[PDB]
């Protein structure tokens, strides 16, 4: 039935993260499902490629650290899950 794994509610990043994060979350959730390891492969990919310091979340909205730093975030909801990637300036 109706059930996808990608829904951007609001993207403030340069889109690249929408494609990267979504695919990182798609390849991470399909390749794995540890939940924690997922956020690591996402933060790791963006950390060892775009240099720190980001902070992606995988759950609902428990991040509470988006604007707290700057304004470099990117929201995207997954099937029965939520993820938010953000970094400081």
From Swiss-Prot:
Protein name, as recorded: Dynein light chain 2, cytoplasmic
Keyword Cytoplasm among UniProt keywords: yes
Sorted UniProt keywords: Cytoplasm, Cytoskeleton, Dynein, Microtubule, Motor protein, Transport
Protein family per UniProt: Belongs to the dynein light chain family.
Pfam families reported for this sequence: Dynein_light
Cysteine pairings via disulfide bonds: none
GO biological process: microtubule-based process
Example of a GO MF term: identical protein binding
Domain of life of the organism encoding this protein: Eukaryota
Subcellular localization(s) per the UniProt record: Cytoplasm, Cytoskeleton
Annotated site residues (Interaction with myosin V motor complex) in this chain: 41
Gene that encodes it: Dynll2
Function: Acts as one of several non-catalytic accessory components of the cytoplasmic dynein 1 complex that are thought to be involved in linking dynein to cargos and to adapter proteins that regulate dynein function. Cytoplasmic dynein 1 acts as a motor for the intracellular retrograde motility of vesicles and organelles along microtubules. May play a role in changing or maintaining the spatial distribution of cytoskeletal structures.
Chief place of localization: cytoplasm
Description of how the protein assembles with itself and partners: Homodimer. The cytoplasmic dynein 1 complex consists of two catalytic heavy chains (HCs) and a number of non-catalytic subunits which present intermediate chains (ICs), light intermediate chains (LICs) and light chains (LCs); the composition seems to vary in respect to the IC, LIC and LC composition. The heavy chain homodimer serves as a scaffold for the probable homodimeric assembly of the respective non-catalytic subunits. Dynein ICs and LICs bind directly to the HC dimer and the LCs assemble on the IC dimer. Interacts with DYNC1I1. Interacts with BMF.
Lineage, highest ranks first: Eukaryota, Metazoa, Chordata, Craniata, Vertebrata
């Amino acid at each position: 039935m109706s059930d996808r794994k990608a829904v951007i509610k609001n993207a403030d990043m340069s889109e690249d993260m929408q494609q990267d994060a979504v695919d990182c979350a798609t390849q991470a959730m399909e390749k794995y499902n540890i939940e924690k390891d997922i956020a690591a492969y996402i933060k790791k990919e963006f950390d060892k490629k775009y240099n720190p310091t980001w902070h992606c979340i995988v759950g609902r909205n428990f991040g509470s650290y988006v604007t707290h730093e700057t304004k470099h975030f990117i929201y995207f909801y997954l099937g029965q899950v939520a993820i938010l990637l953000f970094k400081s300036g």
